Design a protein around this ligand. Sequence first.
Ligand code: NDP
Ligand code: NDP
Ligand code: MTX
Ligand code: MTX
Ligand code: OG7
Ligand code: OG7
Ligand code: UFP
Ligand code: UFP
Lengths: 507, 507
Amino acid sequence: EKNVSIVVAASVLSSGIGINGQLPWSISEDLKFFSKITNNKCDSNKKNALIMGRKTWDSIGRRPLKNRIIVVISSSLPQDEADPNVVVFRNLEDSIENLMNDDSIENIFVCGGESIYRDALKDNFVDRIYLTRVALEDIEFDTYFPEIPETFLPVYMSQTFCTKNISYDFMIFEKQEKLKSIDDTVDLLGEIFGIRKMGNRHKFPKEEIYNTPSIRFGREHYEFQYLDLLSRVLENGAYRENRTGISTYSIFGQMMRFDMRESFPLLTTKKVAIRSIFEELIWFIKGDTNGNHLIEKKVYIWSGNGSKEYLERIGLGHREENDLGPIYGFQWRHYNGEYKTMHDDYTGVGVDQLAKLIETLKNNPKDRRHILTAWNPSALSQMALPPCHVLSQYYVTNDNCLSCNLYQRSCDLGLGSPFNIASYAILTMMLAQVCGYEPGELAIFIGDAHIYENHLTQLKEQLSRTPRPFPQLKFKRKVENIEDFKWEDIELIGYYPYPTIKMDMAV
Amino acid sequence: EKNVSIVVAASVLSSGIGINGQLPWSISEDLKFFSKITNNKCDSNKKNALIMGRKTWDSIGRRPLKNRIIVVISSSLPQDEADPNVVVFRNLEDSIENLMNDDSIENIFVCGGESIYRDALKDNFVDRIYLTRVALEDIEFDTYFPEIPETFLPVYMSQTFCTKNISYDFMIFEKQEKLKSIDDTVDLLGEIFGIRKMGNRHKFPKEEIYNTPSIRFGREHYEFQYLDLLSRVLENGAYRENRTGISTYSIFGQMMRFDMRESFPLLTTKKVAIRSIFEELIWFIKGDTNGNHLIEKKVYIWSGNGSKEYLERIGLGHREENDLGPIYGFQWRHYNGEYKTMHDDYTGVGVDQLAKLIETLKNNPKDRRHILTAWNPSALSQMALPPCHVLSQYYVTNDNCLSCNLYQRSCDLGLGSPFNIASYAILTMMLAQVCGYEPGELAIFIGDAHIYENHLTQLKEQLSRTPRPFPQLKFKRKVENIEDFKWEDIELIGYYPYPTIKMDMAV
Ligand SMILES: NC(=O)C1=CN([C@@H]2O[C@H](COP(=O)(O)OP(=O)(O)OC[C@H]3O[C@@H](n4cnc5c(N)ncnc54)[C@H](OP(=O)(O)O)[C@@H]3O)[C@@H](O)[C@H]2O)C=CC1
Ligand SMILES: NC(=O)C1=CN([C@@H]2O[C@H](COP(=O)(O)OP(=O)(O)OC[C@H]3O[C@@H](n4cnc5c(N)ncnc54)[C@H](OP(=O)(O)O)[C@@H]3O)[C@@H](O)[C@H]2O)C=CC1
Ligand SMILES: CN(Cc1cnc2nc(N)nc(N)c2n1)c1ccc(C(=O)N[C@@H](CCC(=O)O)C(=O)O)cc1
Ligand SMILES: CN(Cc1cnc2nc(N)nc(N)c2n1)c1ccc(C(=O)N[C@@H](CCC(=O)O)C(=O)O)cc1
Ligand SMILES: Nc1nc(=O)c2c(Cc3ccc(C(=O)Nc4ccccc4C(=O)O)cc3)c[nH]c2[nH]1
Ligand SMILES: Nc1nc(=O)c2c(Cc3ccc(C(=O)Nc4ccccc4C(=O)O)cc3)c[nH]c2[nH]1
Ligand SMILES: O=c1[nH]c(=O)n([C@H]2C[C@H](O)[C@@H](COP(=O)(O)O)O2)cc1F
Ligand SMILES: O=c1[nH]c(=O)n([C@H]2C[C@H](O)[C@@H](COP(=O)(O)O)O2)cc1F
């Protein structure tokens, strides 16, 4: 028995694959993907067979594919022995004669329209599925890819790629059937030493809290860098109290890694409020600490830490209603500046870290001191809340890309973390355009990674959703100064998330 | 054809296993390891056979081991059928009849003295070796474990454990003989997209720069967290210039993780100057920036950045010879203090972060703001060198352990990194004793991880050395204040490193 794999490129939601006898898109890299997989063989004196329907055979110009033998399923095509690279069969079952008879065929690929896909799955001929999920859904389709049967399980999901501002993935599905001593030794050592063995302090998450657990070795989509951290906290998190009335499950010392070259790290397993994230970031960039300016733009994330009852509770009753004090955006633009109120004019006072960062990224790109800090011990007592994202470093690669590292001392994985991922991604892209670079990578290093106990049912629901390709984010215009960005300048392309999940903030 | 494994506990350097008819040590957990490994079986109605010499049979009191059959090799013991749990054979080869005849034996273990080990290896009877490396060498031995033949390769090396201040490892050696489509798909995607696929920017290190490459899935010893970072830089490092004349190979965004409960992360692949590391750390704690105080104690690590030629070169010619300026230990003890010279009295000026950190660690252990920073933009111009270890956070676990996270913007993997690993480990243990806790974990997050080009032959030599168990570090007395620590108070137990490697610092 030889292998029979399905190759298909379908839309991410409705699984559309065609329109009016052709594809709904033109993605060059996806065709090169089709070519390399269908040519991938082990024996030199053998070829692969590509099965396709007649309409698909028409759509490719009715011309052969090099180094391969095309098999056309048709009820009315002549079975002429003229073309040795193209053969015609009357039904799909007969065309699977290559298995038993033809020993010159190594592997078999099904890749030819809805009619052939649906019959190849209903008759249980397919061993593996190569799916290319494309992020295009507000268009018209007339040919779809059938629903994948439950007998298949995902084993691979690539990172998100981008062609002509279109996001797409690459997945592999395997059909289900019915080193040995190293794992045993580690288990025995774990029985002897309790939590003395550090592995037992970092236990692998159980399958019941592992997002898409059938993907073991192919967890390439960088949203798994966030989802697996959720799983790691649910497994190893210590129940601990904190300044709020809501206890958490907390571990210490974690990291996440994200790409920004070919996609934008906005979570797809939950609809993330991208507008509020931006309006908070430009609020930091402008140097503003007036909490009213966010409420005037219908952004209330800082209303909890900016009520008169909260400020008098922490010893800042002399402060105005939403005067959050010297915080993010006051240490960015006026570091070590004497803070009075939020209405005063601070032009010239303090150290403008953001300005020095932009000027250093352009004049000395390979400098190792592109640092933006917000942890100022002399001003902590005056802040409405100590900074969570305390320090960030930036890096110019040899191909003119801008990467970013962030250390955040405390991380609300339910609310703050999805914001921190997107917020510092936008900041890096802003810094890249003003400095003339392209976006690079984003790494976030976390101290107290925790989950609030009132987010448990919500985050467990989020872990039940298999991720979708990351969207794209582009700027509509090039700005003179970094302060000039507006919400209308941001174009979010290809974002098809799961429904939003409500989670209450702990004050 | 059953399995024949060797179980042995030998010294780390000389491979001593016995003295005067008994063990050179008493490690309880190692006996539980011997028991669990020799009892590990698959069939309920089968037993394992334990082969041992006569003198070894004497050393265990001539009493049986539960659920197992002991096989004694002796030329003079009576072959009485009285005891069914003990059988005697006249030579080692005859006793390997367990393979052909007794189908009631599942696995075979050789574990009985130098004479049996050497004959079992010279006759090629052993399939696998379970080695427990013990860090005790300045004692007396009379029975040794033979040199492991080249036909064996290590496949596992556990973390370092500790019993009665003795460090030890657990290794597995396999004998050499004569998830398939996922790797193919990822390789094809790497051909289509160049450095567009993030995996190609983080290529797995080649075997020629991978320390002990035969250990694929068992790289548990946390010195591999440092050695693999060296391998990762040699593979992906971009050749970049910097403020010095010595270029580096640099990557961005890396992390290392170390245990501190059962061992001390002092590198064994190179003899690390631990005294200089400590004398620099207490120099930081005391708040001292006078570089002469380190030179007076024969510690010259800061002499390069504190020469009259270097200081005048970077615009500090007004400064005294070794006046390094407000640096580590001046932001620790006197944050935001106006720095004059190194001779002035700074008692009372600035924010004492170290004092507040200790007081916060004791009074509010689960607080999420145990932060010690050294990045002060207002003082960077006055420093002889901006801080490399810029910010650190501390964490109290539910079992009264103190963990530490460090963000390092720039990392000299040849010189600074071995110091940074050990230094912040010592600092965390000092903070743990003054606050009444035990050492926890150490995680180091790195920005610009690089290797200087004049360290290439040296670090490749270091990568050729298989690691040894981490040592132990204990304090001889409980101190009143953290400033009271002295070098004589530190006892380094079980440190048997490889010879030191000379590497020049880039000024
Ligand atoms: N995104 C992707 O990966 C792909 C998309 N497509 C798109 O899908 C569309 C085409 O698919 P689709 O509409 O389903 O047409 P098909 O490609 O499935 O071709 C159908 C033809 O195959 C023959 N056929 C099908 N079933 C049988 C049967 N049971 N017995 C005998 N003959 C059979 C018939 O030929 P006959 O009339 O001669 O009897 C039929 O007309 C196009 O738009 C194409 O571009 C196609 C391939 C891949
Ligand atoms: N750290 C560890 O893992 C272990 C350490 N040890 C230690 O090592 C020491 C003992 O080892 P060791 O000194 O080598 O003594 P052995 O344990 O190897 O026993 C030797 C005896 O086995 C018999 N024997 C050996 N070879 C032959 C042969 N070719 N034909 C017939 N009989 C043979 C002889 O018994 P006879 O004289 O009756 O003929 C010989 O005296 C002890 O200190 C023990 O504690 C032991 C086991 C494990
Ligand atoms: C059958 N078909 C429709 C089509 C389009 N995109 C797809 N995409 C995927 N992922 N899977 C499919 N089955 C698929 N099929 C095809 C098949 C081949 C070519 C084609 O020109 N292939 C060249 C591509 C050459 C190149 O781009 O380098 C080859 O050599 O295979 C176009 C459409
Ligand atoms: C043959 N021998 C010497 C000895 C000591 N340490 C070793 N350590 C290792 N790693 N490997 C060996 N072969 C070894 N052998 C032995 C064998 C068994 C026991 C013993 O008492 N074993 C108990 C373990 C008792 C316990 O768990 O405390 C068992 O149930 O097997 C002591 C010494
Ligand atoms: N404990 C604690 N956690 C914090 O995150 C935090 C912040 C920042 C912040 C970030 C995000 C939110 C928030 O509500 N996000 C949302 C989530 C889902 C759907 C919609 C939204 C939406 O905002 O529309 C609130 C606050 C300041 N102070 C804090 N304290
Ligand atoms: N560029 C750059 N790199 C740095 O590491 C650095 C430091 C800290 C430091 C740390 C270590 C050394 C050093 O020489 N270590 C050794 C290594 C092997 C064997 C012996 C020694 C020994 O000292 O005895 C020098 C300096 C201050 N300023 C710096 N600038
Ligand atoms: O950007 C943010 N990210 C974040 O994770 N938090 C959460 C983390 C923690 O749950 C809470 C309070 O921090 P702490 O209790 O350490 O003072 O703020 C707040 C932000 F503003
Ligand atoms: O504790 C230290 N750790 C460290 O890694 N360096 C190295 C890193 C780098 O090679 C150099 C400073 O880089 P730069 O001056 O360009 O920021 O010092 C120096 C220390 F003092």
